[PDB]
Amino acid sequence: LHKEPATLIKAIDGDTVKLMYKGQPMTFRLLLVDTPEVKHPKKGVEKYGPEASAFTKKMVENAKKIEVEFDKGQRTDKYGRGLAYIYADGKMVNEALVRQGLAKVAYVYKPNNTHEQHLRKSEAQAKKEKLNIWS
């Protein structure tokens, strides 16, 4: 894998951000993580939804460099969203969310699962510490 630069356009919610990537706007879905929802007519705002959303948002808005990392499998989903690991000044947003109890490790689809173990380790630590979703 390798990182490529992108520019923030808009944070959307906890696990979706809009970036400029190679000259075009693109919506990116964060690989391997599930955050509580802020929209979606179903329940609308699930618990910790607004918190994960503000966390993702502050982390990418305060960054001086954003990088995207595609995994080895498909790089877009059926909704045309890019599927990637997002880095803010060198720190993976996907792991930070999980480390803080603000996301769970998603259902995993090989071969898009390179950072699966790292993330499950951060999730177990957040569980032990009983943070946010785990309290």
UniProtKB/Swiss-Prot annotation:
UniProt: Ca(2+) binding residues: D15, D34, T35
Domain of life: Bacteria
Region (Disordered): 115-135
List of catalytic residues: R29, E37, R81
Locations listed in the record: Secreted
Biased composition range(s): Basic and acidic residues: 115-131
Protein name per its UniProtKB record: Nuclease A
Lineage of source species: Bacteria, Bacillati, Bacillota, Bacilli, Bacillales
Residue span relative to the full protein: 89 to 223 of 231
